[PDB]
Write a protein that binds this ligand. Structure first.
Ligand SMILES: Nc1ncnc2c1ncn2[C@@H]1O[C@H](COP(=O)(O)OP(=O)(O)O)[C@@H](O)[C@H]1O
Ligand SMILES: [Mg+2]
Ligand SMILES: [Zn+2]
Length: 669
RNA sequence: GAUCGAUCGAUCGGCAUCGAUGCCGAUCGAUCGAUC
């Protein structure tokens, strides 16, 4: 098998003494093997007749499966029962029967949180060792911190029997929210108090050997200047001005619906302003329901078109103009398909009047993004130096990931590249998402052998998944906190690797330099903490734990009183009566449906998605689901305005949990 | 293997109010229930 290195034995030494240790070491050095050695030493120290129980908390399903496989192939030779519980595990052989029948359990923290809050697992005393992978996640409300809250509530006050030894496997404590070394040390002490850790054991003696396994790449900042002559921006800004003039002509009070004063086209401030204006335009009352519906539908269309124009302007500055033009054309084609209206056809004609010159200015070699030119130059130079380079180019959004893939594929200069996509799971309003087997299939094809040369990921390829060692870590306008910096920089650990930060905004380079200074502060604070006496640090973390427990035990009132007044759900686009709250049945607190035949005449089905039934509204109301034996349609509260019956207020709600009303359970009879 | 609905958590950017609170957009992770 494997032979433990000297620094791997130095990192496991404080934890093999029985002390709660935070093992901070760079990515790719073998912290999983350190945890394996610690668990092997822990399970062997119990006398005959007694047995230890180790739990390993992983926060992701791929990481959970990988750690379960590793622990099973490593420990089932000794005769230990290794198991794993997750969300994909079938609801059989209950958890209290699994934990009691195994020695090593690979868990996700939410499963243990659920089993502790429901009373299945009464105490954490059934375990003798807890190993949190990526323990820097122990923070405000993370499930790691819920497990540690249970641990500390058992420790302080209600002193029950023995408590397990806690060990973390982070790579960066993340002093973030601090501005100097003292605040960084304070945050680090708070982190060791959250995990009840007294040692921050790092590699100090065998550092010449650790540097031969992992390599720290060289950071290079690339600040580019935005294009001076932007005619695409000119045309889209004229279209936005026309739409805004129409909306102001039909509303007359747009400048008082939001407090955004200085808003420019193509910014996030304008997006906030248009979202606020769209939300304020839905809550509109007047003693004329036809006029109210007409005004609200027209303002909905105007605000949606303005938001789409702003989205295209934001897309066109990080990618090609062809990408924003395709975004706008797809939006207009999909908005024509539902049903065209006088206002909507006027807007469509206004867009199509400028569509040809937009196509002409978008298909121009001179009007190309300078950021993309610098990216092409960097890729060309790197792949001319070493033609077997592999890149882990980091992107912020999924649309930009697809844009960069389509640009790399259609670039005559980047013919040596074979781009691969890696987005996160979970559907969105525009993208579908990548499942777990798709991510696994793409991650195995991206290696030094072939079948994939460059991976275009979005914040999913930097935390816990296993990727090949890259030689190029280009960050396409991608800056976060110090943890994200150390994580993305740690993706390329091959010898002689670079990490480029390409940006066109003076202030992002400053953010990354602040992150570097914060990493320096973090290292200095860890080194300063490692010199304290263990008793003084234990007293400090005990005082911190007592203070935080006192603060935490004073927040136990997060529950309002549910309302029972009758309220009507109207459409959000046309503001037509959809249904009443008295007809809304909820099945299992998650499947809010409508009971009645009057609602069946209000929606049209096109599983089958249900939309409004007005002349030209076609607003998405909900979807058909399949229960045990039923095919009832469920609705979404984010598609309706809630008007009171007695009063006339029309409050808006984002999710059903914000809407407090008398939710009657669904009954099939 | 492919989804649906609901919920939780973390991160970044932006906005409003008085460093804090609240909100919006984007990104990621996980959990409960149901279906093919
Ligand atoms: N003693 C060792 N000898 C050889 N290879 C090792 C040794 N320890 C660790 N490794 C390798 O280093 C890699 C580290 O992977 P992993 O533990 O997932 O990342 P990290 O250490 O950053 O958490 C493993 O794939 C393992 O094969
Ligand atoms: Mg790891
Ligand atoms: Zn409608």
């Amino acid at each position: 098998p494997f032979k433990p290195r000297n620094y791997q034995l130095e990192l496991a030494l404080p934890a093999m003494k029985g002390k709660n240790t935070i093992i901070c070491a760079p990515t790719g050095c073998g912290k999983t093997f350190v945890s394996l050695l610690i668990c092997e030493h822990h399970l062997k120290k119990f006398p005959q007749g007694q047995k230890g129980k180790v739990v390993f908390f992983a926060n992701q399903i791929p990481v959970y499966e990988q750690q379960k496989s590793v622990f099973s192939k490593y420990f089932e030779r000794h005769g230990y029962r290794v198991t794993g519980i997750s969300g994909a595990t079938a609801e059989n052989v209950p958890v209290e029967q699994i934990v009691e029948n195994n020695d090593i359990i690979i868990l996700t923290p939410q499963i243990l949180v659920n089993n502790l809050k429901k009373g299945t697992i009464p105490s954490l005393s059934i375990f003798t060792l807890m190993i949190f992978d990526e323990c820097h996640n122990t923070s405000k409300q993370h499930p790691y911190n819920m497990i540690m809250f249970n641990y500390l509530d058992q420790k302080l006050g209600g002193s029950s029997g023995p408590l397990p030894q806690v060990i973390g496997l982070t790579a960066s404590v993340g002093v973030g929210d601090a501005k100097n070394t003292d605040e960084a040390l304070d945050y680090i002490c708070k982190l060791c108090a959250s995990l009840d850790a007294s040692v921050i054991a790092t590699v100090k003696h065998n550092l010449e050997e650790l540097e031969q396994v992992v390599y720290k790449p060289q950071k290079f900042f690339r600040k580019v200047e935005s294009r001076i002559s932007d005619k695409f921006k000119y045309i889209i800004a004229q279209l936005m001005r026309d739409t805004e003039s129409l909306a102001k002509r039909i509303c007359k009070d747009l400048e008082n619906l939001s407090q955004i004063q200085n808003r420019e086209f193509g910014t996030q401030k304008y997006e906030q302003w248009i979202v606020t204006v769209q939300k304020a335009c839905m809550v509109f009352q007047m003693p004329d329901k036809d006029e109210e519906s007409r005004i609200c539908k027209a303002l909905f269309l105007y605000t949606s078109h303005l938001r789409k124009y702003n989205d295209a302007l934001i897309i066109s500055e990080h990618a090609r103009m062809k990408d924003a033009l395709d975004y706008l054309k797809d939006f207009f084609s999909n908005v024509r398909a539902a049903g065209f209206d006088e206002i909507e056809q006027d807007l469509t004609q206004r867009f199509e009047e400028k569509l040809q010159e937009l196509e002409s200015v978008s298909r121009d070699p001179s009007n190309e993004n300078p950021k993309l030119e610098d990216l092409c130059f960097i890729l060309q130079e790197e792949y001319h130096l070493n033609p077997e380079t592999i890149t882990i180019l980091f992107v912020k959004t999924r649309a930009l990931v697809d844009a960069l893939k389509n640009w790399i594929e259609g670039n005559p200069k980047l013919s040596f590249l074979k781009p691969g996509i890696l987005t996160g799971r979970g559907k969105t309003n525009q993208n579908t998402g990548m499942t777990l087997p798709a991510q696994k299939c793409i991650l195995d094809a991206f290696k030094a052998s072939g079948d994939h040369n460059i991976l275009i990921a979005t914040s999913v390829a930097d935390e816990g998944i296993d990727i090949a060692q890259c030689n190029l870590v280009i960050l396409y306008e991608y800056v976060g906190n110090v943890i994200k910096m150390i994580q993305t920089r740690g993706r390329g650990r091959a010898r002689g690797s670079k990490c480029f930060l390409l940006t066109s905004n003076a202030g992002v380079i400053e953010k990354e330099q602040i992150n570097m200074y914060k990493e320096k502060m973090m290292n200095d604070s860890i080194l300063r903490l490692q010199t304290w006496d263990e008793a003084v640090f234990r007293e400090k973390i005990l005082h911190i734990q007592t203070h935080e427990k006192f603060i935490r035990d004073s927040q136990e009132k997060p529950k309002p009183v549910p309302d029972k007044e009758n309220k009507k759900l109207l459409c959000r686009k046309c503001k037509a009566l959809a249904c009443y709250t008295a007809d809304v049945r909820v099945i299992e607190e998650c499947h809010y449906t409508v009971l009645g035949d009057a609602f069946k005449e209000c929606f049209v089905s096109r599983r089958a998605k249900i939309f409004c039934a007005r002349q030209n509204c076609s607003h998405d109301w909900g979807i058909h689901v399949k229960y045990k034996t039923f095919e009832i349609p469920v609705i979404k509260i984010e598609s309706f305005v809630v008007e009171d019956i007695a009063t006339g207020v029309q409050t808006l709600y984002s999710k059903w949990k914000d809407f407090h009303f008398e939710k009657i359970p669904f009954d099939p009879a």
